[PDB]
Write an enzyme that holds these catalytic residues in place. Sequence first.
Site, PDB file in Angstrom:
ATOM      1  N   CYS A 164       0.101   2.783  -4.400  1.00  0.00           N
ATOM      2  CA  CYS A 164      -0.565   4.051  -4.680  1.00  0.00           C
ATOM      3  C   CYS A 164       0.384   5.173  -4.277  1.00  0.00           C
ATOM      4  O   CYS A 164       1.234   4.986  -3.407  1.00  0.00           O
ATOM      5  CB  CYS A 164      -1.883   4.172  -3.911  1.00  0.00           C
ATOM      6  SG  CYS A 164      -3.223   3.156  -4.575  1.00  0.00           S
ATOM      7  N   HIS A 216       0.857  -1.172   0.000  1.00  0.00           N
ATOM      8  CA  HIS A 216       0.000   0.000   0.000  1.00  0.00           C
ATOM      9  C   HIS A 216       0.902   1.233   0.000  1.00  0.00           C
ATOM     10  O   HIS A 216       2.048   1.175   0.458  1.00  0.00           O
ATOM     11  CB  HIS A 216      -0.891  -0.002   1.244  1.00  0.00           C
ATOM     12  CG  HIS A 216      -2.113   0.855   1.121  1.00  0.00           C
ATOM     13  ND1 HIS A 216      -2.129   2.186   1.479  1.00  0.00           N
ATOM     14  CD2 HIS A 216      -3.365   0.566   0.692  1.00  0.00           C
ATOM     15  CE1 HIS A 216      -3.335   2.683   1.269  1.00  0.00           C
ATOM     16  NE2 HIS A 216      -4.104   1.722   0.790  1.00  0.00           N
TER      17      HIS A 216
END
Lengths: 163, 163, 87, 87
Positions: free
Chosen positions: B151, B103
């Site tokens: 991301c 992430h």
Amino acid sequence: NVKLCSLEEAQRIWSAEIYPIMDKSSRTRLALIICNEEFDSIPRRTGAEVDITGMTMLLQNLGYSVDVKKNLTASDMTTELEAFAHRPEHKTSDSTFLVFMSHGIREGICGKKHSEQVPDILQLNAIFNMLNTKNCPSLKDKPKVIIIQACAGDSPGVVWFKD
Amino acid sequence: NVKLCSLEEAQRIWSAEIYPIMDKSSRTRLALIICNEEFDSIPRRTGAEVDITGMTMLLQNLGYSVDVKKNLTASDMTTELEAFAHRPEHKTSDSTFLVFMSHGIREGICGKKHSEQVPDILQLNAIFNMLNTKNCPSLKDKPKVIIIQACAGDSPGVVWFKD
Amino acid sequence: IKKAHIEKDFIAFCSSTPDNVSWRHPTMGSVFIGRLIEHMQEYACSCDVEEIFRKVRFSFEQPDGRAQMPTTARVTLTRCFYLFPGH
Amino acid sequence: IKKAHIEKDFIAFCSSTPDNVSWRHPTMGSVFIGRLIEHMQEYACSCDVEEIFRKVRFSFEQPDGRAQMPTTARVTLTRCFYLFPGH
């Protein structure tokens, strides 16, 4: 001042992995040079005129109409960039060049009023934002080249070794 | 799994603008994959094993000895990177690959314990620092490729238009 | 309505690596700018901008005297950008 | 003692532009990683890594469905890096 790409050279380069170039007679290529030479709290950037001359001549010879702006705060730089991004000539252009020349720190480019006490900085992030697809739709799908002459901090950028 | 560069292809590429490759028999190429799948405050990164498999097989077939580390905090990632940079095999290597899969947010890559309340982030800046000429002298003059799957913020990254 | 990438077809070329100084001769001008003009003058005809910029970086390879290392940043060029000088 | 550049011969390749999401299929894997493997498999033989990475970026050009744009970051490669697969 630029070595020319001959007809057989352009044919050798030309397939679908190249940015399309607009017809010479109809295109309106734009470029912008922002150069800060005089500052409130930083010594004069002597020799900047040599940089301005060289870059202007080069970009003109590459086919760009070159606008030159001198000694601006980060705010004025922002306004100038906003005006530049909205110029209708970009719609009949295939590309653009943005040249920034100033004192610099890690955070970004120094405006004319920059100090350690009162920062006057244009961030690199902000430059991209002002020229992206939302804020500059006329340059969507077209190469945008950003050139920066500035320090990115005050380290000499070296490490010493014996062996 | 990789298409091979033939002898006539390698000769066609070979002049002084290419990174030198070490002899196959004597070289000790290293690569590191850090992949976070399980998190304290973020949903499981299902499908990460497909990524691990593909990247490991690819890098091995490119000649790299691949080390895989799973589910680490930014601190553990740091320690691992420090150990990796100090590995003596780099002296008899010509290059390296660093793969990070997790992430992510704008600030950087998420460690296994990351939350909005208590951040656990490895900065991209720190990755470069740990692998530079000072901290990793054995990879001085040698290409260091960093691959990130994460991301960089939570925006879909799009703008809408009518015409 | 239709979707488009917010950020695409960008390239930035900076005079030095993050944290680090860039150099400017008081009468001769900035070294990076001078080096950039010379390489654009010579190679715009045969190389795309990414290739030209790499060539500029190579010229600074030896950290002689006032060392600096130009950097290409935030690249979203999806194609090769040739200037096609003369065309 | 002798001087050397603190930061040189780096390239970073990120799955999306700053601020923006990257996508991962729950069973098929991350799109950027899958795309990267396929392009490395095909082009490592004939293209340097910068060229391969540009080719990956091109494949995301059309913002269909779950749009993202991979980015090359902080590049200080002074030469072309060819993998020379098989050698």
